[PDB]
């Protein structure tokens, strides 16, 4: 009915891409080499 946007609004960013939970837990963007 209305366009909820991912990137913002955490909850819709979990229905798209269930891996985002894992991405947040391990940080992954903040990764050391």
């Amino acid at each position: 009915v209305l366009k909820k946007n991912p990137l913002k609004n955490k909850q819709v960013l979990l229905r798209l891409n269930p891996y985002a939970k894992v991405f947040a837990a391990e940080k992954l963007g903040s990764k050391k080499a």
Binding site: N5, L7, R15, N17, Y19, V22, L28
Partner: protein, 241 residues
Amino acid sequence: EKILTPESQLKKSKAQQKTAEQVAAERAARKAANKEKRAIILERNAAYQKEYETAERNIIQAKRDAKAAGSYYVEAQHKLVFVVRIKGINKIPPKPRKVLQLLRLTRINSGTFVKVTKATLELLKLIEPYVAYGYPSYSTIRQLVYKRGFGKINKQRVPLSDNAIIEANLGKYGILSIDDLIHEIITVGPHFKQANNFLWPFKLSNPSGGWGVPRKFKHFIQGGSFGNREEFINKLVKSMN
């Protein structure tokens, strides 16, 4: 005695139950199917996350190994461009205007992906004064598909916002989620024509910061906006998003 149900209404209850018990059993065997589907999507995204990481690390490592060995590493030829219309509808010559319709760049500030080959480079050459094209990141495609990403179903510019939609339409071509679609864009896969054409030509706003330049209609190389900008397209499109 006592009143009885009509023999149409008696039938109603029976046929409703027949459909309802079927529907409840069908629904219950779809929650389990979507749960299993969710698990497939999760492990695929883990596989892609690992793949993109190892991709950029091997480019870094190859560059490091060239300078160490005293050789020169040629980087892989950019195989995907993102073309954004920069000029309006009016005072456009026939020869480029047809080409802009063929890239689905009808209105101003409209953006599409193009497969880069021998043929399409000459198409981009014709429309040079009217577009700003460049090579997208992973980040920008991800931002474009989540915010300005829309699907073409029979006609109808449909909002994505759910994996089930892409699964139904493009499940034929091995794409079964939103990030499967993004994967088909960034790495120009076997089904690129299908995944790109499914995506509706993006409708971008004018850039948040501005165009930078005082005058827009010059080449980027000489303080303009049009033509190839290669890497700075990511900075531009993110403001236009």
